[PDB]
Structure 1
Amino acid sequence: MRECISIHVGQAGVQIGNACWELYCLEHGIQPDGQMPDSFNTFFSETGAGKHVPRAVFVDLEPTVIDEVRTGTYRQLFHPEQLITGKEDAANNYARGHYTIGKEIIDLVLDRIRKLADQCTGLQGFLVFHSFGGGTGSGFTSLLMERLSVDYGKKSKLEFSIYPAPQVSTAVVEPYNSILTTHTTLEHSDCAFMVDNEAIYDICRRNLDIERPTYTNLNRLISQIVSSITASLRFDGALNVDLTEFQTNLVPYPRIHFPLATYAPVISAEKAYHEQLSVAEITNACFEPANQMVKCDPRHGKYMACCLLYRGDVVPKDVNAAIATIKTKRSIQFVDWCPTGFKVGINYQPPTVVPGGDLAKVQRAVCMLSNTTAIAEAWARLDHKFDLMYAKRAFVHWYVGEGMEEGEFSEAREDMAALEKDYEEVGV
């Protein structure tokens, strides 16, 4: 009866989704056809003679990544109708992928979510994977979230939005389309689990010491964090924290919802033989500036709240000492108003990590969130990127050519400017 649905979008969601459902198909013990030789109810649906299909929907206007899925090994379980393919992508262009060509596809995708929402008994909410730099992965969501918000305003629409690094910005115009969406993110969604792609390279090159990562190795990591959030509503636990609880107690104000993510233990197999991976160890492996995957400096900021989603063989007694330990630390800090910001979710089931992946078969795992003020320094870089060229008005004639007027650019930045000031307001 506990239910939620995944909305993979753009090049990012699909590359994540082929590796995100790589996990669930191995958590429950189901072949990549769909058969399962309850927990699965939230993301599967028991249909036919032993064939469980995911409650996903994939939308990339590029027809290629889905054709890799429709031809790949997961061709069978994914329903071919919700594997939207489009005709031609928006070419990393927000205004193009919003209404010019996106309107051709929103009419279709909103039927499957209405098919699944009507088929699902009761949802805690949605979850939408996407990236800012994709343009069509981003501007489509600017149009999708408002349709789903009007269609479903009471439900919670969280998002694991990829975010470009200040150094490794793989695109050229993604300084534009990022802040254009964040004006739309706060309006409709309620928590944007931001993630950076350059940080994970620093996560994996050092902790699990991989010399050269692929997006596969990167994506197999960000599958565990999402599964760890949703294991409460999907598995048994001493202290279950389903999707509707932690979003309520993590977000103080209705606009300040941008928690950076974190996962632990992130270590190779050879290195895991050495550490016992105690709760005081891995919990302390979450707050250092390294293991965070958003490329910000948490020490300069201050946590408001946090939410620890333990897994595997875990008991509260040792984290009860841990949550007391960090409150002694002065390098780590907390805003004055929140005395205690540590939700503690447990699941007796271990991660059951993917095979062919860098991660190890640890019997313990942690996710972690924090609605900090340190995230403000992230887009303080990007807001400088956007502001210096919009004054020059470069790369804008494409957006103008697609329909979006110049006024939206000034309205998206000033909102992020006004959004930024709140972090100094709330901080003291």
Structure 2
Amino acid sequence: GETITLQVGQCGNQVGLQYWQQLATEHGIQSDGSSTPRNDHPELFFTLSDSNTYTPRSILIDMEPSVIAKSTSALPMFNPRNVHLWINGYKYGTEEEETLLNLIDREVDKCDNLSNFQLFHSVAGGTGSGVGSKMLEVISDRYGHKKLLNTFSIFPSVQPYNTILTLKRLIDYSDATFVFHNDSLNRIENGANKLIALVSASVSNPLRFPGYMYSSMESIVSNLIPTPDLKFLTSSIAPFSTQKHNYLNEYDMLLELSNDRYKTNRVGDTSYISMLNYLIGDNLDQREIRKGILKSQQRISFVPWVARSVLVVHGKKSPYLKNTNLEGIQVTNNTSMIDVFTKILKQFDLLIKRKAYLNRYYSSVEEENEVMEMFNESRESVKSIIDEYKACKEITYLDDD
């Protein structure tokens, strides 16, 4: 089925520009939307006119026109009709609810069979994070739960308040949320949006370049989310490619994809809940992959109550990329989320006991009570998810004792 991309905020718009440039390069679509000389299926991400032009399905949302202007000028094939221009931002989103609801309904009507909503946004984006938090609520309300949502939220490197307020709605409404940290991205680079764009583009490779299996997003996601509570994913990318000293075999890709240094978020000891590895090359040797799967299963520490299966998808490289060597992406579901969530909660508590900057949000007695109850609910939800991820680790998870 078709997918709709939502871009919110300055960071979201920049990441989306890199993402769409990568996708258009992979499908050979020119900057003006004209084709270049089919077995691939860009229709899932591009709308095809009866004049042979490809335009992205994405929707651009931002508080200021400079970022949107740069993005549109860089890629002229964006449709201008889809362009629209913390608590203050969220209340502003309430005012524009009708316009945005109709704007999204236009894209849904334009496609034939909708599958999922992609969202590119930054949790630490301030006002834009507020408008994206409202976007999740309105979409989930109007379209129910038949269509799932995927959020490629960028985590932060007064900010604690914003991170908690955005994470409350991220937990409530998102169906499968990727976690990216600028710290680990710049550590890997030792710009940064080119890693996120690459990971997001590769995550959907089996859909755009069909093969024997994994033809739908339901199959890709369902392998990684045993419970709707544990919805945060850790993504790992192998950087050593296109150099002379590349990984010599896909088997070494499978073994060295699990290194903790390549993960896109700060990690000690972790337990894996689910696994799925992407291998993308013109030709793939099966016996190497079998040996690598066996070693990966014998090496990785799974939680007791999970089936303990490692899945390797055999992605196909784009014809428009000339004979490049193998590359691969790893997406995992770990219990390492407790560390980052604990860090966020510690910062939030430290800055909530001290009334440092709450004057910018508490306007009156009723506003004080409103913000206090909202903050308490967000804190309780985050603690609930931490406790759930902690109870997953132990062996008595399925016991009623």
TM-score by length of structure 1 reads 0.85
For residues 152 and 286 of structure 2, the distance between their equivalents in structure 1, rounded to whole angstroms, comes to 28
Aligned with residue 156 of structure 2, among 164, 171, 184: 164
For residues 418 and 113 of structure 1, the distance between their equivalents in structure 2, rounded to whole angstroms, comes to 32
Give 2:391's aligned amino acid.
E
Aligned with residue 298 of structure 2, among 321, 325, 328: 328
Tell me the CA shift for residue 347 of structure 1.
Answer: 2.0
For residues 393 and 290 of structure 2, the distance between their equivalents in structure 1, rounded to whole angstroms, comes to 26
Give 1:382's aligned amino acid.
I
Residue 285 of structure 1 is matched in structure 2 by 256
Q: Which moved more, 1:279-288 or 1:343-352?
A: 343-352
For residues 303 and 362 of structure 1, the distance between their equivalents in structure 2, rounded to whole angstroms, comes to 31
Give 1:52's aligned amino acid.
Y
For residues 376 and 117 of structure 2, the distance between their equivalents in structure 1, rounded to whole angstroms, comes to 30
Residue by residue over 1:151-183, the C-alpha shift from the partner in whole angstroms, topping out at 9 and shown as x without a partner, is: 222101010000013xxxxxxx22111122222
Tell me the CA shift for residue 275 of structure 1.
Answer: 2.5
Distance 1:318 1:352, change over 3 A: farther
Native 8 Å contact 1:262 1:368 kept in 2? yes
Residue 144 of structure 1 is matched in structure 2 by 135
Tell me the CA shift for residue 49 of structure 1.
Answer: 2.0
Native 8 Å contact 1:5 1:127 kept in 2? yes
SS of the equivalent of 2:245 reads: coil
SS of the equivalent of 1:20 reads: helix
Tell me the CA shift for residue 410 of structure 1.
Answer: 1.6
Distance 1:335 1:316, change over 3 A: farther
For residues 379 and 180 of structure 2, the distance between their equivalents in structure 1, rounded to whole angstroms, comes to 20
SS of the equivalent of 2:187 reads: helix
Residue 225 of structure 1 is matched in structure 2 by 199
Residue 103 of structure 1 is matched in structure 2 by 94
Residue 220 of structure 2 is matched in structure 1 by 246
Tell me the CA shift for residue 352 of structure 1.
Answer: 6.4
For residues 391 and 241 of structure 1, the distance between their equivalents in structure 2, rounded to whole angstroms, comes to 50
SS of the equivalent of 1:18 reads: helix
SS of the equivalent of 1:176 reads: helix
Aligned with residue 67 of structure 1, among 66, 69, 73: 69
SS of the equivalent of 2:183 reads: helix
SS of the equivalent of 1:194 reads: strand
Residue 267 of structure 1 is matched in structure 2 by 240
Give 2:274's aligned amino acid.
A
For residues 315 and 102 of structure 1, the distance between their equivalents in structure 2, rounded to whole angstroms, comes to 51
Native 8 Å contact 1:311 1:351 kept in 2? no
Residue by residue over 1:22-65, the C-alpha shift from the partner in whole angstroms, topping out at 9 and shown as x without a partner, is: 11111111110111135110111111422110000010112210
Residue 6 of structure 2 is matched in structure 1 by 7
Alignment of 1:8-157 (within 5 A): 8-37=7-36, 39-70=41-72, 72-74=73-75, 76-84=76-84, 86=85, 94-99=86-91, 101-153=92-144, 154-157=146-149
For residues 346 and 110 of structure 1, the distance between their equivalents in structure 2, rounded to whole angstroms, comes to 38
Q: Which moved more, 1:386-395 or 1:340-349?
A: 340-349
Residue 399 of structure 2 is matched in structure 1 by none
Tell me the CA shift for residue 268 of structure 1.
Answer: 6.2
Matched, 1:341 2:341: no
Aligned with residue 383 of structure 2, among 417, 424, 427: 417
Residue 179 of structure 2 is matched in structure 1 by 194
Native 8 Å contact 1:383 1:413 kept in 2? yes
For residues 295 and 276 of structure 1, the distance between their equivalents in structure 2, rounded to whole angstroms, comes to 24
Residue by residue over 1:302-321, the C-alpha shift from the partner in whole angstroms, topping out at 9 and shown as x without a partner, is: 00111112212324432222
Structure 1 stretches of 4+ with a deviation exceeding 4 A read 350-353
Distance 1:316 1:103, change over 3 A: farther
Residue 272 of structure 2 is matched in structure 1 by 303
SS of the equivalent of 2:232 reads: coil
Structure 2: segments with no counterpart, 5+ residues: 395-401
For residues 35 and 188 of structure 1, the distance between their equivalents in structure 2, rounded to whole angstroms, comes to 37
Give 1:320's aligned amino acid.
R
Residue by residue over 1:187-235, the C-alpha shift from the partner in whole angstroms, topping out at 9 and shown as x without a partner, is: 2111110100111111111xxxxxxxxxxx2112211211111111111
Residue by residue over 1:52-84, the C-alpha shift from the partner in whole angstroms, topping out at 9 and shown as x without a partner, is: 1000001011221001123x231x210112122
Distance 1:362 1:379, change over 3 A: farther
The share of aligned pairs that are identical, in percent, is: 28
Native 8 Å contact 1:82 1:109 kept in 2? no
Residue by residue over 1:281-340, the C-alpha shift from the partner in whole angstroms, topping out at 9 and shown as x without a partner, is: 22223221100001124xx120011111221232443222212112222xx411111232
For residues 31 and 351 of structure 1, the distance between their equivalents in structure 2, rounded to whole angstroms, comes to 15
Distance 1:315 1:122, change over 3 A: farther
Native 8 Å contact 1:13 1:58 kept in 2? no
Give 2:195's aligned amino acid.
L
Residue by residue over 1:123-173, the C-alpha shift from the partner in whole angstroms, topping out at 9 and shown as x without a partner, is: 2211101011112232112211111111222101010000013xxxxxxx2
Tell me the CA shift for residue 346 of structure 1.
Answer: 1.8
Q: Which moved more, 1:340-349 or 1:287-296?
A: 340-349
TM-score by length of structure 2 reads 0.90
Tell me the CA shift for residue 279 of structure 1.
Answer: 1.7
Native 8 Å contact 2:297 2:309 kept in 1? no
C-alpha RMSD of matched pairs (Å): 2.1
Structure 1: segments with no counterpart, 5+ residues: 87-93, 166-172, 206-216, 354-359
For residues 177 and 414 of structure 1, the distance between their equivalents in structure 2, rounded to whole angstroms, comes to 15
Give 1:222's aligned amino acid.
I
